[PDB]
Amino acid sequence: DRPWWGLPCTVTPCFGARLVQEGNRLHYLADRAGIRGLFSDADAYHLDQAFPLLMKQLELMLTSGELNPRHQHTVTLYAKGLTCKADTLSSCDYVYLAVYPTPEMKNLE
Ligand SMILES: [Cl-]
Ligand SMILES: [Mg+2]
């Protein structure tokens, strides 16, 4: 079956991808991405629509320095009902990401 390329994550469902990091530019590779589980139709749609924005935000953070290729540091971003985690994992080559439905706090809801 397919291997996992994204940021370590136990949430299900989850979209994981390993982005090629070149300078302050990020490159998405479909063959270096995949999904664990099944996204509701609503989530799959929001994931797809927000991906370009997410990419841009991550590059902004590279340009600004928040995301550093030589340091392990996890940043958090949001999108309609989705949580996006990203980290270079000090790889000096990539930005690993994990996007999943924001967990519901069942005990408070
Ligand atoms: Cl994992
Ligand atoms: Mg980092």
Coordinates of N, CA, C and O and ligand atoms in Angstrom, one line a residue:
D1 N 0.9 -1.2 0.0 CA 0.0 0.0 0.0 C 0.9 1.2 0.0 O 2.1 1.2 -0.2
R2 N 0.3 2.4 0.3 CA 1.0 3.7 0.2 C 1.6 4.1 1.6 O 1.0 3.9 2.6
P3 N 2.9 4.6 1.6 CA 3.6 5.0 2.8 C 3.1 6.4 3.2 O 2.5 7.1 2.4
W4 N 3.5 6.8 4.4 CA 3.1 8.1 4.9 C 4.3 9.1 4.7 O 5.4 8.8 5.1
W5 N 4.0 10.2 4.1 CA 5.0 11.2 3.8 C 4.9 12.5 4.7 O 5.8 13.3 4.7
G6 N 3.7 12.6 5.3 CA 3.5 13.8 6.1 C 4.1 13.9 7.5 O 4.9 13.0 7.9
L7 N 3.8 14.9 8.2 CA 4.3 15.1 9.6 C 3.7 14.0 10.4 O 2.6 13.6 10.2
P8 N 4.5 13.5 11.4 CA 3.9 12.4 12.2 C 2.6 12.8 12.7 O 2.4 14.0 13.2
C9 N 1.6 12.0 12.7 CA 0.2 12.3 13.1 C -0.6 11.1 13.3 O -0.6 10.1 12.6
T10 N -1.4 11.1 14.4 CA -2.3 9.9 14.8 C -3.7 10.2 14.5 O -4.6 9.3 14.6
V11 N -4.0 11.4 14.1 CA -5.4 11.8 13.9 C -5.9 11.1 12.6 O -5.1 11.0 11.6
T12 N -7.2 10.7 12.6 CA -7.8 10.1 11.4 C -9.1 10.7 11.2 O -9.9 10.9 12.1
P13 N -9.4 11.1 9.9 CA -8.6 11.0 8.7 C -7.5 12.1 8.8 O -7.6 13.0 9.5
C14 N -6.5 12.0 7.9 CA -5.5 13.0 7.8 C -4.8 13.0 6.5 O -4.7 11.9 5.8
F15 N -4.5 14.2 6.0 CA -3.8 14.4 4.8 C -2.3 14.7 5.1 O -2.1 15.5 6.0
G16 N -1.4 13.9 4.5 CA 0.0 14.1 4.8 C 0.8 14.3 3.6 O 0.5 13.7 2.5
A17 N 1.7 15.3 3.6 CA 2.6 15.6 2.4 C 4.0 16.0 2.8 O 4.1 16.7 3.9
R18 N 4.9 15.7 2.0 CA 6.3 16.2 2.2 C 6.6 17.2 1.1 O 6.7 16.8 0.0
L19 N 6.6 18.5 1.4 CA 6.9 19.5 0.4 C 8.4 19.7 0.2 O 9.2 19.7 1.2
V20 N 8.8 19.9 -1.0 CA 10.2 20.2 -1.4 C 10.4 21.7 -1.0 O 9.7 22.5 -1.5
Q21 N 11.4 21.9 -0.2 CA 11.7 23.3 0.2 C 12.9 23.8 -0.5 O 14.0 23.3 -0.2
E22 N 12.8 24.8 -1.3 CA 13.9 25.4 -2.1 C 13.9 26.9 -1.8 O 13.0 27.6 -2.3
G23 N 14.7 27.3 -0.9 CA 14.8 28.7 -0.5 C 13.5 29.0 0.2 O 13.1 28.3 1.2
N24 N 12.7 30.1 -0.2 CA 11.5 30.4 0.5 C 10.3 29.9 -0.4 O 9.2 30.3 -0.2
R25 N 10.6 29.0 -1.3 CA 9.7 28.4 -2.2 C 9.3 27.0 -1.7 O 10.2 26.2 -1.3
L26 N 8.1 26.6 -1.9 CA 7.6 25.3 -1.5 C 7.0 24.6 -2.7 O 6.3 25.2 -3.5
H27 N 7.3 23.3 -2.9 CA 6.8 22.6 -4.0 C 6.0 21.4 -3.6 O 6.6 20.5 -3.0
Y28 N 4.8 21.3 -4.0 CA 3.9 20.2 -3.7 C 4.1 19.0 -4.7 O 4.0 19.3 -5.9
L29 N 4.3 17.8 -4.2 CA 4.4 16.6 -5.0 C 3.3 15.7 -4.6 O 3.3 15.2 -3.5
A30 N 2.4 15.4 -5.6 CA 1.3 14.5 -5.3 C 1.8 13.1 -4.9 O 1.2 12.4 -4.1
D31 N 2.9 12.6 -5.5 CA 3.4 11.3 -5.2 C 4.1 11.3 -3.9 O 4.7 10.3 -3.5
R32 N 4.1 12.4 -3.2 CA 4.8 12.6 -1.9 C 3.7 13.1 -0.9 O 4.0 13.8 0.0
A33 N 2.5 12.6 -1.2 CA 1.3 13.0 -0.3 C 0.3 11.8 -0.3 O 0.5 10.9 -1.1
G34 N -0.7 11.9 0.6 CA -1.6 10.8 0.6 C -2.6 11.1 1.8 O -2.4 12.0 2.6
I35 N -3.6 10.3 1.9 CA -4.6 10.4 2.9 C -4.8 9.1 3.7 O -4.7 8.0 3.2
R36 N -5.0 9.3 5.1 CA -5.2 8.2 5.9 C -6.7 8.3 6.4 O -7.1 9.4 6.9
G37 N -7.5 7.3 6.1 CA -8.9 7.3 6.4 C -9.7 7.9 5.4 O -9.3 8.0 4.2
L38 N -10.9 8.4 5.7 CA -11.9 9.0 4.8 C -12.3 10.4 5.3 O -12.9 10.5 6.3
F39 N -12.1 11.4 4.5 CA -12.5 12.7 4.8 C -14.0 12.9 4.4 O -14.4 12.4 3.3
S40 N -14.8 13.5 5.3 CA -16.2 13.7 5.0 C -16.1 14.6 3.7 O -15.1 15.2 3.4
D41 N -17.2 14.6 2.9 CA -17.2 15.4 1.7 C -16.9 16.9 2.0 O -16.2 17.5 1.2
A42 N -17.5 17.3 3.1 CA -17.3 18.7 3.5 C -15.8 19.0 3.8 O -15.3 20.1 3.4
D43 N -15.2 18.1 4.4 CA -13.7 18.3 4.8 C -12.8 18.2 3.6 O -11.9 19.0 3.4
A44 N -13.1 17.2 2.7 CA -12.3 17.1 1.5 C -12.3 18.3 0.7 O -11.3 18.7 0.1
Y45 N -13.5 18.9 0.6 CA -13.7 20.1 -0.2 C -12.9 21.3 0.4 O -12.3 22.1 -0.3
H46 N -13.1 21.5 1.7 CA -12.4 22.6 2.4 C -10.8 22.4 2.3 O -10.1 23.4 2.2
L47 N -10.4 21.1 2.4 CA -9.0 20.8 2.4 C -8.5 21.3 1.0 O -7.5 22.0 0.9
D48 N -9.1 20.8 0.0 CA -8.7 21.1 -1.4 C -8.7 22.6 -1.7 O -7.8 23.1 -2.4
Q49 N -9.8 23.4 -1.2 CA -9.9 24.8 -1.5 C -8.8 25.6 -0.7 O -8.4 26.6 -1.2
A50 N -8.5 25.2 0.5 CA -7.6 25.9 1.3 C -6.1 25.6 1.1 O -5.2 26.3 1.5
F51 N -5.8 24.5 0.4 CA -4.4 24.1 0.1 C -3.5 25.2 -0.4 O -2.4 25.3 0.0
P52 N -4.0 25.9 -1.5 CA -3.1 26.9 -2.0 C -2.8 28.0 -1.0 O -1.7 28.5 -1.0
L53 N -3.8 28.4 -0.2 CA -3.6 29.4 0.8 C -2.6 28.9 1.8 O -1.7 29.6 2.2
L54 N -2.8 27.6 2.2 CA -1.9 27.0 3.2 C -0.5 27.0 2.7 O 0.5 27.4 3.4
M55 N -0.3 26.6 1.4 CA 1.1 26.7 0.8 C 1.7 28.1 0.9 O 2.8 28.2 1.3
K56 N 0.9 29.1 0.5 CA 1.3 30.5 0.6 C 1.7 30.9 2.0 O 2.8 31.5 2.2
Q57 N 0.9 30.5 3.0 CA 1.2 30.8 4.3 C 2.5 30.2 4.8 O 3.3 30.8 5.5
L58 N 2.7 29.0 4.4 CA 3.9 28.3 4.8 C 5.2 28.9 4.2 O 6.2 29.0 4.8
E59 N 5.0 29.4 3.0 CA 6.2 30.1 2.3 C 6.4 31.5 3.0 O 7.6 31.9 3.0
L60 N 5.4 32.1 3.4 CA 5.5 33.4 4.0 C 6.3 33.2 5.3 O 7.3 34.0 5.6
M61 N 6.0 32.1 6.0 CA 6.8 31.8 7.2 C 8.2 31.4 7.0 O 9.1 31.6 7.8
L62 N 8.5 30.9 5.8 CA 9.9 30.6 5.4 C 10.6 31.9 5.2 O 11.7 32.1 5.6
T63 N 10.0 32.8 4.4 CA 10.5 34.1 4.1 C 10.7 34.9 5.4 O 11.8 35.5 5.5
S64 N 9.7 34.9 6.2 CA 9.8 35.6 7.5 C 10.8 34.9 8.5 O 11.3 35.6 9.4
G65 N 10.9 33.6 8.3 CA 11.9 32.9 9.2 C 11.2 32.1 10.3 O 11.9 31.3 11.0
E66 N 9.9 32.2 10.4 CA 9.2 31.4 11.4 C 9.4 29.9 11.2 O 9.6 29.1 12.1
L67 N 9.4 29.4 9.9 CA 9.7 28.1 9.6 C 11.2 28.0 9.2 O 11.6 28.7 8.3
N68 N 12.0 27.3 9.9 CA 13.4 27.2 9.6 C 13.9 25.8 9.3 O 13.7 24.9 10.1
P69 N 14.5 25.7 8.1 CA 14.9 24.4 7.5 C 15.9 23.6 8.4 O 16.0 22.4 8.4
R70 N 16.6 24.3 9.3 CA 17.6 23.7 10.2 C 17.1 23.5 11.6 O 17.9 23.1 12.5
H71 N 15.8 23.8 11.9 CA 15.3 23.7 13.2 C 14.0 22.9 13.3 O 13.1 23.2 12.4
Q72 N 13.8 22.1 14.3 CA 12.6 21.3 14.4 C 11.6 22.2 15.2 O 11.9 22.6 16.4
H73 N 10.6 22.7 14.6 CA 9.6 23.5 15.2 C 8.3 23.4 14.4 O 8.2 23.7 13.2
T74 N 7.2 23.0 15.1 CA 5.9 22.8 14.5 C 5.0 24.1 14.5 O 4.7 24.6 15.6
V75 N 4.6 24.5 13.4 CA 3.7 25.7 13.3 C 2.3 25.1 13.1 O 2.1 24.0 12.6
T76 N 1.3 26.0 13.4 CA -0.1 25.6 13.3 C -0.8 26.6 12.5 O -0.7 27.8 12.7
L77 N -1.7 26.1 11.6 CA -2.5 26.9 10.7 C -3.9 26.4 10.7 O -4.1 25.2 11.1
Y78 N -4.8 27.2 10.4 CA -6.2 26.8 10.3 C -6.9 27.1 9.0 O -6.5 27.9 8.2
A79 N -8.0 26.3 8.8 CA -8.8 26.4 7.6 C -10.2 25.9 8.0 O -10.3 25.1 9.0
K80 N -11.2 26.3 7.3 CA -12.6 25.8 7.6 C -12.7 24.4 8.2 O -12.6 23.4 7.4
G81 N -12.8 24.3 9.5 CA -12.9 23.1 10.2 C -11.6 22.2 10.1 O -11.7 21.0 10.3
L82 N -10.5 22.8 9.7 CA -9.3 22.0 9.6 C -8.1 22.5 10.3 O -8.0 23.8 10.4
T83 N -7.3 21.7 10.8 CA -6.0 22.0 11.5 C -4.9 21.6 10.6 O -4.9 20.4 10.2
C84 N -3.9 22.4 10.4 CA -2.8 22.1 9.6 C -1.5 22.3 10.4 O -1.2 23.4 11.0
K85 N -0.7 21.2 10.6 CA 0.5 21.2 11.3 C 1.6 21.1 10.2 O 1.4 20.4 9.3
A86 N 2.7 21.8 10.4 CA 3.8 21.8 9.5 C 5.2 22.0 10.2 O 5.3 22.8 11.2
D87 N 6.2 21.3 9.7 CA 7.5 21.4 10.4 C 8.6 21.0 9.3 O 8.3 20.1 8.5
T88 N 9.7 21.6 9.4 CA 10.8 21.3 8.4 C 11.5 20.0 9.0 O 12.2 19.3 8.4
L89 N 11.3 19.9 10.3 CA 11.9 18.8 11.1 C 13.4 18.9 11.0 O 14.1 17.9 11.1
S90 N 13.9 20.1 10.8 CA 15.3 20.4 10.7 C 15.9 19.6 9.5 O 17.1 19.2 9.5
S91 N 15.1 19.3 8.5 CA 15.5 18.5 7.3 C 16.4 19.2 6.3 O 17.0 18.6 5.4
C92 N 16.4 20.6 6.2 CA 17.1 21.3 5.2 C 16.8 20.7 3.8 O 17.8 20.3 3.1
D93 N 15.6 20.5 3.5 CA 15.1 19.9 2.3 C 13.6 19.9 2.1 O 13.1 20.1 1.0
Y94 N 12.9 19.8 3.2 CA 11.5 19.7 3.2 C 10.7 20.4 4.3 O 11.3 20.9 5.3
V95 N 9.4 20.4 4.1 CA 8.5 20.9 5.1 C 7.4 19.8 5.1 O 6.8 19.5 4.1
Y96 N 7.3 19.1 6.2 CA 6.4 18.0 6.4 C 5.1 18.6 6.9 O 5.1 19.5 7.8
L97 N 3.9 18.2 6.4 CA 2.7 18.7 6.9 C 1.6 17.6 7.1 O 1.7 16.5 6.5
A98 N 0.7 18.0 8.0 CA -0.4 17.1 8.3 C -1.6 18.0 8.5 O -1.5 19.0 9.2
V99 N -2.7 17.6 7.8 CA -3.9 18.4 7.8 C -5.0 17.4 8.2 O -5.2 16.4 7.5
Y100 N -5.8 17.8 9.2 CA -6.9 16.9 9.7 C -8.1 17.7 10.2 O -7.9 18.9 10.4
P101 N -9.2 17.1 10.3 CA -10.4 17.8 10.8 C -10.1 18.2 12.2 O -9.7 17.4 13.0
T102 N -10.4 19.5 12.6 CA -10.2 20.0 13.9 C -11.0 19.1 14.9 O -12.2 19.0 14.7
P103 N -10.3 18.5 15.8 CA -11.0 17.6 16.8 C -12.1 18.3 17.5 O -11.9 19.5 17.9
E104 N -13.2 17.7 17.7 CA -14.3 18.2 18.5 C -14.1 17.9 19.9 O -13.6 16.8 20.3
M105 N -14.4 18.8 20.8 CA -14.2 18.6 22.2 C -15.6 18.1 22.7 O -16.5 18.8 23.1
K106 N -15.7 16.7 22.6 CA -17.0 16.1 22.9 C -17.5 16.3 24.3 O -18.7 16.3 24.6
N107 N -16.6 16.4 25.3 CA -17.0 16.6 26.7 C -17.5 18.0 27.0 O -18.2 18.1 28.0
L108 N -17.2 18.9 26.1 CA -17.7 20.3 26.3 C -18.8 20.6 25.4 O -19.6 21.6 25.7
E109 N -19.0 19.9 24.4 CA -20.1 20.1 23.4 C -21.4 19.4 23.9 O -22.4 20.0 23.8
Ligands
CL1 CL 2.7 9.1 11.7
MG2 MG 10.3 23.8 11.6

